[PDB]
């Protein structure tokens with residue numbers, strides 16, 4: 001959590017998650033990039049004993065993000081008061 | 084060095100128009116392991132969760148009901164490691 | 167007053183410095199500091215037939231308690247008496263445990279009360295992954311809740327209001343930047 005108080009493992013193991021680099025999140029799923037799989041992979045936010053492949057690459061994939069409105073919710077900007 | 088690699092370095096693609104190829108029946112010693120891209124890697128490195136030969140073939144089949152190579156060392160839930 | 171962003175809050179309405187939050191001490195009267203700092207463990211609370219021991223307040227399934235291997239933080243599970251089942255008028259069932267046995271209500275979403283002599287329905291909404299966003303109690307049941315931008319499906323999951331454009335994925339594969347659809351069927355190159 002934001003305060004570091006409750007800690008949960010989503011997946012572990014050399015065969016399942018050998019070398020992850022980047023991670024992104026949306027709804028039920030997390031998308032992460034792995035250099036050993038040379039892949040972009042999809043997994044379940046709460047527990048996944050067998051992740052799946054979303055895209056397979058010939059080169060190591062580095063960065064991943066999810067593009068959607070609800071990933072960037074609105075809020076007030078204090079700096080609006082004349083910078 | 085750019086003469087023959089993954090990249091198309093000139094507008095005509097003349098670097099990658101033609102290239103040499105591997106001489107068949109080349110040798111990797113029995114002390115070592117062979118990768119699908121025709122490269123040789125030490126057997127101790129193979130299932131270390133890290134991409135030692137860049138096609139990912141060393142990490143291709145770990146924990147298919149198998150065990151670590153006899154010289155390796157094992158971590159109960161995680162991976163086989165070099166001596 | 168409320169806590170600042172550099173502080174932590176406790177169920178009793180108490181404010182604590184953020185560094186104390188996971189330092190290994192019960193600075194919070196409710197023990198909320200160290201609630202889950204150990205990976206995948208739970209402190210001072212139990213799933214329906216788990217049992218907790220005085221050493222560090224960590225809860226473990228009863229079957230393993232007297233199995234012959236120390237599962238408790240202090241090994242207190244390894245002893246294994248029965249005497250208290252004779253003393254107790256508890257309503258369901260007994261197990262051979264250190265400290266003279268233990269009594270537990272039926273496994274199906276019920277658990278012991280203020281003493282083993284009494285029982286109540288289980289804390290659903292305490293299960294990890296029981297709902298995508300928020301959970302509420304109901305009479306013999308539980309209910310999901312999703313925030314304003316989401317709509318509730320399959321009784322467990324939250325999906326995004328169609329008012330918003332279809333979600334996309336943007337990822338890099340070394341040399342190129344690629345855009346794709348959440349179903350993973352189509353991919354294009356953005357740069």
Ligand SMILES: *[C@@H]1O[C@H](CO)[C@@H](O)[C@H](O)[C@H]1NC(C)=O
Pocket residue numbers: 069070072073074315
């Ligand atoms: C954020 O505000 C803009 C401007 O009113 C609106 O178009 C957009 O839908 C809002 N998004 C959310 C998630 O509230």
Ligand SMILES: *[C@@H]1O[C@H](CO)[C@@H](O)[C@H](O)[C@H]1NC(C)=O
Pocket residue numbers: 279280286
């Ligand atoms: C314990 O007893 C108090 C007083 O009757 C009551 O308010 C509380 O809900 C009880 N707690 C449990 C878990 O039974």
Ligand SMILES: *[C@@H]1O[C@H](CO)[C@@H](O)[C@H](O)[C@H]1NC(C)=O
Pocket residue numbers: 316317327328329
């Ligand atoms: C979807 O969003 C629109 C605009 O906010 C709202 O009027 C509508 O009720 C929402 N639908 C659902 C099912 O939440």
Ligand SMILES: *[C@@H]1O[C@H](CO)[C@H](O)[C@H](O)[C@H]1NC(C)=O
Pocket residue numbers: 103104105106107
């Ligand atoms: C290069 O490799 C190809 C197979 O991909 C052929 O075997 C060809 O004969 C090779 N060329 C040389 C000169 O060895």
Ligand SMILES: *[C@@H]1O[C@H](CO)[C@H](O)[C@H](O)[C@H]1NC(C)=O
Pocket residue numbers: 107108109110111
């Ligand atoms: C060389 O490689 C071939 C396979 O390509 C054989 O394994 C052979 O035994 C190797 N060693 C020698 C000395 O030829």
Ligand SMILES: *[C@@H]1O[C@H](CO)[C@H](O)[C@H](O)[C@H]1NC(C)=O
Pocket residue numbers: 149150151152153
């Ligand atoms: C793992 O151990 C078993 C015996 O339990 C077999 O010897 C098997 O061949 C071993 N696997 C590897 C890769 O050495």
Ligand SMILES: *[C@@H]1O[C@H](CO)[C@H](O)[C@H](O)[C@H]1NC(C)=O
Pocket residue numbers: 167168169170171
């Ligand atoms: C507590 O929260 C209120 C808003 O509800 C104010 O932000 C107040 O400043 C906060 N207290 C502290 C100590 O920052």
Ligand SMILES: [Ca+2]
Pocket residue numbers: 085086087088089090091092098099
């Ligand atoms: Ca080239």
Ligand SMILES: [Ca+2]
Pocket residue numbers: 128131133135
């Ligand atoms: Ca290595």
Ligand SMILES: [Ca+2]
Pocket residue numbers: 128129130131132133134135141142
């Ligand atoms: Ca390796």
Ligand SMILES: [Ca+2]
Pocket residue numbers: 018019131132133
């Ligand atoms: Ca690794």
Ligand SMILES: [Ca+2]
Pocket residue numbers: 186189190191192193
């Ligand atoms: Ca302290």
Ligand SMILES: [Ca+2]
Pocket residue numbers: 186187188189190191192193194199200
């Ligand atoms: Ca503390």
Ligand SMILES: [Ca+2]
Pocket residue numbers: 230231232233234235236237238243244
């Ligand atoms: Ca035990």
